[PDB]
Amino acid sequence: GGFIRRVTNDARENEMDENLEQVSGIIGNLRHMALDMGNEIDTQNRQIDRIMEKADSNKTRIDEANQRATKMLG
């Protein structure tokens, strides 16, 4: 509805203007969706470091515990 320089009064031109307007609004929604998706995924990726550091710390603590228990065996 006013998205292009209309060169004719045809129904074909009228459909073209509405179809382009609908495409443009979906792209504008996708722009904001991509920004939300990037914000959530970056936060989630750095959550993996938080989980991994805790996982290696507990695995190393279990190695210490296994070594400590094994050293009381004789």
């Binding site: 320089r5 060169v7 495409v23 792209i27 996708l30 228990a69």
Partner: protein, 72 residues
Amino acid sequence: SKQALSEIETRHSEIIKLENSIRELHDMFMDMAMLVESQGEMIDRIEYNVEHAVDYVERAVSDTKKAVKYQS
């Protein structure tokens, strides 16, 4: 000045370019959707190995608490 055939033929040329700009974005979404879904299949292995480790820890700590109790 302004001429109708030149405007429509040029406009059609930019519209087919706009479709191919969207086509690259579409190709990226389909590959990204496959990859994040495929990574989600891998996370099931990580989850089960961790949950099975929780069963071993829950048993091991319980038995360790039983073991220490015999020291008077």
